[PDB]
Design a protein around this ligand. Sequence first.
Ligand SMILES: *P(=O)(O)OCC(C)(C)[C@@H](O)C(=O)NCCC(=O)NCCS[C@@H]1CC(=O)N(CCN2C(=O)CCC2=O)C1=O
Lengths: 77, 301
Amino acid sequence: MWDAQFENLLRRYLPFLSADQPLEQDINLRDIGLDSLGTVELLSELENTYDVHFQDEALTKETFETPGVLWKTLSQM
Amino acid sequence: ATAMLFPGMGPAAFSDVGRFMVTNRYTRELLAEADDTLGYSLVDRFRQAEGDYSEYAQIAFLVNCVALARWAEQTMDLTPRICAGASFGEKSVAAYSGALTFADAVRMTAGLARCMDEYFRTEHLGVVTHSFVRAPRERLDEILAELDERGEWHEISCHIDHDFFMLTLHERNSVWLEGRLRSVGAMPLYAMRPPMHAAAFGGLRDKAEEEVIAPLTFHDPTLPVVADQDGKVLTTGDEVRTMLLECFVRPLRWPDVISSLQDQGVTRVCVAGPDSLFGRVGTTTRAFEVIAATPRLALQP
Ligand SMILES: *P(=O)(O)OCC(C)(C)[C@@H](O)C(=O)NCCC(=O)NCCS[C@@H]1CC(=O)N(CCN2C(=O)CCC2=O)C1=O
């Protein structure tokens, strides 16, 4: 279970999710609008905001499949 | 000062563009000319296509891209000094710029699509083009040297930004390449088939010349066109013919196109069409104010 700092950030990259719609844990980010360059800018904002460096398995597409896997993967740093 | 930019192809479906193509009057006009030229209903064959990048999808992208440029010009009263097209977009600018009639550009696009499919049916099997980011040249060189070390063939096929490149090579090395990229913080994007932009494809270049490009009549453009191979401002039909050919065997150099544009006085850019890359990448962003002329934008009131 994540917080509002994470989610406000993440929603700036999901154009097909409306502000009045919840971010489900298992929802697929590609279908909700995240694309290649979005992912890139999203990595960027996460690495500043949280002072981490993504690497090795954290750079596979799988990391970015859902908010749930992405939050999990991020917490670990 | 403003420029007109035509983007490369990217991931999408008929659902994304279908309402636009059937509703916008620019596109309807162009679809009519395209049908009369191909001998079929483009929209109908695109509608029922079983791919991401069929022939029919490619011609539809041409049409959408050109119509959106005509659409942005009238809607937003743009008065472009100069234009440019990346990769697939070379074909878009040819038609926008006046280097070919729309009908020849449709023929062209259709011919080259068949021609790529024949060629890559048997040639350079297993070769792929990898895109990746967060990879400064320093890091990429280390990887390439490790590839040279094992005697594995490769070619840098595109320069997108300082840390954003495309590399072509046998798919046998893909998984390792991916893993090794990630080791140093680089992120794999996509692994494209067919491949594109390599000296080793001079064979494809000849076949597009003989089977498809040679019969066409090119005209000098009504505005100059910046070549995506190296930032050269072009001004004649024959220079536009050449860019379309060199494209198969010379790598795309997007920081060079941005350079010329800046050097020719350009402050602002309109990117015509659906766009996953060239209108969004930092190389374009840091230099210019961007107007994204996408089917979504053309369906607001
Ligand atoms: P993420 O998956 O959201 O984004 C990935 C990425 C940003 C790389 C996105 O832009 C992408 O997927 N690119 C699409 C690559 C792809 O799969 N293309 C398939 C082949 S199609 C297109 C058709 C075509 O002919 N070209 C160029 C060929 N060409 C020239 O460039 C000049 C002359 C010529 O024939 C295409 O790009």
